[PDB]
């Protein structure tokens, strides 16, 4: 119920619309990180390096286990018992996910037993990875037959030291991207048999901001278990998002403007702003984790609906609010503080003192100039051919002084 045409008389300009996408149901998949590679048949050539690698790794895995064991449990195991402590709504969802993982533990362990010994880099039955396995099977094992175990062991050690250095950066929640960087693969390749295939360029960007969680460390066979929650994206109906910008507005040789949020939303019969800081923009949608809407002031909603007279205004403090803008084939600008010229550069057009902002139409004249620069206008533009009475301040000191003034007023009136 935004009225774009009318608002232009005040300075507020609204960009073209865009839809919204939200994620309500997730798909859960399990990732097992086996940190010790397996060398098939090499007469234990690399055992010395692996033990050094193991000793180095014990400096990172031991603290992880101690932190996990010190984590309080929100609910102790339909779905479980409440537990003693304090936990809000945002914690209960994580607790439910953890309980689901606890239920799946049995099959996770069966799969671990199945894969205990095997050389495959990635399996699927869920998906399991094994440290630097491709590198090993590609060059280290074949090269043992040419360079001997001294040079082979040296390169193996270099590789494992580099891998350990790469770790302690991801684990020093864990970003999903960090992990996809560690193993040179895309997100699509890891979860090929999933819904990730039907994603666009802007959707993968959203899946990279979610955080993964650690739910098990073994400490005998060095491994880590992770839980990933891939979203399912369904576009809402009858929900639009806009973008708002404001320009200067003349009131007796002084500059003002109309303060509004950076974005505006209308869903059904609900008019309100949108905080899209956490959302990822797209060419037609706004991918958002939660509902971004936040209730706006009553006056602002009335103003945006079309009631021009109850929009408030404030003073301009710095050179950040523009003084002119392109709207549709023509310009709207505060010509009092910015010289505006019609066809001839010499010719000057002055906005009468009463008027706030001046709207050209490209039928008024063909070429218009600004304080410098010249534009020749668009033939096919859609642009077409008043007291505010609500002044506000945005600085607390301003408000406090007015409060003190009214205070003195009552003190005087009491007599």
């Amino acid at each position, epitope marked *: 119920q935004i009225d774009i045409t009318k608002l232009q008389h005040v300075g507020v300009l609204v960009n073209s619309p865009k839809g919204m996408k939200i994620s309500q149901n997730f798909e859960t998949r399990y990732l097992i990180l086996s940190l010790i590679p397996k060398i*098939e048949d090499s007469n*234990s050539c690399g055992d010395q390096q692996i033990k050094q690698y193991k000793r180095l790794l014990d400096r990172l895995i031991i603290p992880l286990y101690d932190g996990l064991k010190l984590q309080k449990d929100v609910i102790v195991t339909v779905i479980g018992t409440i537990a003693l402590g304090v936990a809000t709504s945002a914690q209960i969802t994580a607790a439910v996910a953890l309980v689901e993982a606890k239920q799946a533990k049995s099959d996770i362990e069966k799969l671990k037993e199945a894969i205990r010994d095997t050389n495959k880099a990635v399996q699927s039955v869920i998906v399991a990875i094994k440290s630097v396995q491709d590198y090993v099977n590609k060059e280290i094992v074949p090269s043992i037959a040419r360079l001997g175990c*001294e040079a082979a062991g040296l390169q193996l050690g270099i590789a494992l030291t580099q891998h350990y250095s790469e770790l302690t950066n991801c684990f020093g929640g864990i970003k999903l991207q960090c992990i996809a960087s560690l193993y040179r693969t895309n997100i699509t390749e890891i979860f090929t048999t999933s819904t990730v295939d039907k994603y666009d360029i802007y959707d993968l960007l959203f899946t990279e901001s979610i955080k993964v969680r650690v739910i098990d460390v073994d400490l005998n066979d060095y491994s880590i278990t992770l839980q990933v929650r891939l979203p399912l994206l369904t576009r809402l109906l009858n929900t639009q998002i806009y973008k708002v910008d404001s320009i200067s507005y003349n009131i007796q040789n002084r500059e003002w403007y109309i303060p509004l949020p950076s974005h505006i939303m209308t869903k059904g019969a609900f008019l309100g702003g949108a905080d899209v800081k956490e959302c990822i923009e797209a060419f037609s949608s706004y991918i958002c984790p939660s509902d971004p809407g936040f209730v706006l002031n009553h006056e602002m909603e009335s103003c945006l609906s079309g009631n021009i007279s109850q929009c408030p205004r404030t003073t301009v403090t710095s050179d950040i609010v523009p003084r002119y803008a392109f709207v549709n084939g023509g310009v709207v600008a505060n010509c009092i503080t910015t010289t505006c010229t019609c066809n001839g550069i010499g010719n000057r057009i002055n906005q009468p003192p009463d008027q706030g902002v001046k709207i050209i139409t490209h039928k008024e004249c063909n070429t218009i100039g600004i304080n410098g620069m010249l534009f020749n206008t668009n033939k096919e533009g859609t642009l077409a051919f008043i007291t505010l009475n609500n002044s506000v301040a945005l600085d607390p000191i301003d408000i406090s002084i007015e409060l003190n003034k009214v205070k003195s007023d009552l003190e005087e009136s009491k007599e």
Partner: antibody
Amino acid sequence: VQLLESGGGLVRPGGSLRLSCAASGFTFSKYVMAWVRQAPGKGLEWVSSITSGERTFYADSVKGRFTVSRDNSKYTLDLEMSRLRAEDTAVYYCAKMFKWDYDTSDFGVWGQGTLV
Amino acid sequence: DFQMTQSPSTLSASVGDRVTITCRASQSVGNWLTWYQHKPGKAPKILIYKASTLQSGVPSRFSGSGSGTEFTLTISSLQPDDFATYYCQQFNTYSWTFGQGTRVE
């Protein structure tokens, strides 16, 4: 402990022969084995090598004509020959490689050999 | 491209004296080395198989040490039944290599 060998002899040049080196006394399933040659009044020379998994390396001199194999069940090793020349008149030995670690339970063995 | 060479090729000494034999490697072969004794008419045996560890049954006369590219085996006191050809063996590479040998008085 013991690695007996048998199958040596003298054959017409260019023939085919098959030597055997049976094993016992320890676990034969986790030790690479290779063969070493010794020309009379000359230095010891490597021959070939076979791994648990039939990797089947070879030496340059005898590559392309020798076929070695192993069996993990019967604890038996064999070596085969083809297109024999006059340059190999030496004693063939059945030998166990070492595990490249400092294990205190490791050891070594060496066979009796075949005159050939 | 690994090679193993040792000198002196021939050696003469007297009982109770000291005998020193050295094997040199073209490249870095590692700690992996073995020492062999070859008496005529007998199957070769082993004395030290990692350059440091001694197989059971070998007298304490034999002692060796080193690493990398230079190795040397030295015996404190000789005995009359110790005249035989001696060898240097690398087992770093699947393809084994020997030295050419030594003879002692």
